[PDB]
Amino acid sequence: SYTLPSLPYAYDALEPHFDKQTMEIHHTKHHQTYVNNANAALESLPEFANLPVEELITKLDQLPADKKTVLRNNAGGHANHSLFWKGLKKGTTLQGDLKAAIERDFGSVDNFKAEFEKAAASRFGSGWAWLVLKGDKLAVVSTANQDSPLMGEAISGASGFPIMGLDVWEHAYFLKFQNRRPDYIKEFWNVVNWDEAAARFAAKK
Amino acid sequence: SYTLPSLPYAYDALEPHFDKQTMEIHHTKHHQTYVNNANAALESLPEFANLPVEELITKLDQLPADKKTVLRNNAGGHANHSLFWKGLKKGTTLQGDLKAAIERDFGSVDNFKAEFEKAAASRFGSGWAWLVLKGDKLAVVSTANQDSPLMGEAISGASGFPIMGLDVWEHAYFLKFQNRRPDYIKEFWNVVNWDEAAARFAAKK
Numbered sequence: 461s462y463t464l465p466s467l468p469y470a471y472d473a474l475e476p477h478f479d480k481q482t483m484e485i486h487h488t489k490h491h492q493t494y495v496n497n498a499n500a501a502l503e504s505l506p507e508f509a510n511l512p513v514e515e516l517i518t519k520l521d522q523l524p525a526d527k528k529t530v531l532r533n534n535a536g537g538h539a540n541h542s543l544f545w546k547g548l549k550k551g552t553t554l555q556g557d558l559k560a561a562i563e564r565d566f567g568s569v570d571n572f573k574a575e576f577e578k579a580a581a582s583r584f585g586s587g588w589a590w591l592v593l594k595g596d597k598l599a600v601v602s603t604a605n606q607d608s609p610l611m612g613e614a615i616s617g618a619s620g621f622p623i624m625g626l627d628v629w630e631h632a633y634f635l636k637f638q639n640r641r642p643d644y645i646k647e648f649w650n651v652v653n654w655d656e657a658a659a660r661f662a663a664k665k
Numbered sequence: 666s667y668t669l670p671s672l673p674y675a676y677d678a679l680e681p682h683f684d685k686q687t688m689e690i691h692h693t694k695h696h697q698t699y700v701n702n703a704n705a706a707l708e709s710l711p712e713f714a715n716l717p718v719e720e721l722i723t724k725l726d727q728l729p730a731d732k733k734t735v736l737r738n739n740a741g742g743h744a745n746h747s748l749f750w751k752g753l754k755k756g757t758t759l760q761g762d763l764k765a766a767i768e769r770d771f772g773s774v775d776n777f778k779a780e781f782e783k784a785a786a787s788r789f790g791s792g793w794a795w796l797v798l799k800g801d802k803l804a805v806v807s808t809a810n811q812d813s814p815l816m817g818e819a820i821s822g823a824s825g826f827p828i829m830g831l832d833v834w835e836h837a838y839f840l841k842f843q844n845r846r847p848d849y850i851k852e853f854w855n856v857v858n859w860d861e862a863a864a865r866f867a868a869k870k
C-alpha cells in the first residue's frame with residue numbers, strides 16, 4: 461500500500477516562511493487523503509498497487525479505462541506531495557552545476573525566477589508550478605490539479621523530469637497568505653531545497 | 666464597470682452553518698479580486714464593459730482572442746459569486762413548483778440531493794456544482810474553476826440556466842472544514858436559499 465511519508469523535518473522547520481499549522485494540516489489531512497483514495501482505487505489492481513507512485517504516474521495509459529481519472533488525480537496527488545516535502549528545506553543555496561545550467565537555459569537566475577513566478581501566478585484554479593528537465597534543457601511549466609509532467613504532454617499539458625515544484629492549491633497558502641498567491645510564491649524562494657534539486661538534476665542530466 | 670455587490674445579509678447570517686470569517690474574506694478579498702481583474706480587462710473594451718456580467722459570460726465567443734481567458738476566469742468569478750450570495754439563506758423550505766419539478770426530473774428530492782452531493786464532491790480541483798434548467802428539464806452539472814453553465818458546452822463542458830449552485834473552491838470551506846469538503850456540502854443544505862431558487866425557476870420555467 462502507499463503510506464503517508466514521514467517528513468524530512470518538523471512541521472515548524474520552514475518558519476518563518478511557510479507556516480507550521482499549514483504544514484501539519486497539509487501533510488496529515490490533504491496528503492493522507494490522496495494516499496487513502498489511491499490505495500482504494502488500486503486494491504483491485506495487484507499489477508499496479510505495489511509499484512512506486514512515481515512509476516505508476518508514467519503508465520496511466522496502461523490502466524483499465526475506469527481507473528485512469530481516479531489514479532491520475534490521487535496517484536498524482538501522492539507523487540506530487542511526496543516530491544514537495546523532499547523539495548523544501550531551509551539552509552540551501554542555488555549554486556554549482558544546477559545554477560550554471562539555470563543561467564545557460566534562462567540567461568540568468570533572475571530570469572528563471574521571474575519565469576517561475578509568472579507561471580506559478582498564472583495557474584488559474586488549482587495546480588503546480590515546476591522546474592523540469594526536458595531533453596537536457598531546463599524549463600518552467602505548470603500543471604492543473606494533481607497532474608504531473610511525468611504523466612506526459614497528452615495528459616498533463618507538460619512534460620519533462622521534475623527538478624522541483626511549488627504547490628499552488630489554495631490549501632498550501634490560505635492560512636498565512638489568504639488570496640495573496642504572489643506573496644506565497646516569493647516566500648517559496650526561502651524554502652526551496654536547492655540540494656535536492658541539484659541531486660535530481662545530477663541524476664537525470 | 667463591475668462592482669462588488671452588497672449582500673442580502675450580514676456576514677454572520679449563515680451561522681452556525683457557514684462561518685462568518687470565511688463569508689467576509691470570501692466577499693471582500695476573493696470576490697473583490699475577480700471584480701478588479703475583470704474590470705482591468707474590460708478597460709479597453711467599452712462595447713463589452715456595460716454588459717451585465719451574467720450576459721457577458723454568455724458572449725465570450727465575441728471577445729478578442731487575447732481577452733477570452735482573462736474574462737472567462739474573472740467575469741465567470743464575478744457572475745458565480747454574485748449568484749452564490751443571493752443563493753444562500755437560512756430557514757427556507759423547498760416547496761411548490763420547484764419541488765415538483767425536482768421530483769419529476771430526479772424521481773425524488775433525496776435522489777436529487779444525492780446526485781448534487783456526488784457532483785459537488787467529485788469536482789476535482791477548483792470549481793462549482795450547479796442545479797441547471799435546460800429548456801424543459803432540470804439537471805445537475807459541475808464546472809471547473811470559474812466556468813459557468815451560462816458559458817455553454819463548448820467553453821465550460823456544461824450548459825443550462827443556473828437555478829442555484831455551490832462553490833467548491835477550497836477558499837469557501839478551508840477555515841472551518843479544512844479538507845472535509847463532504848462536511849461543507851452537508852452544511853450547504855441548511856443554507857441553500859430555496860426561495861431564490863424558486864424565484865429563478867419561476868422566471869425561467
Ligand code: MH2
Pocket residue numbers: 486490541627628629631632
Ligand atoms: O496540492 Mn497540496
Ligand code: MH2
Pocket residue numbers: 691695746832833834836837
Ligand atoms: O470560487 Mn469562491
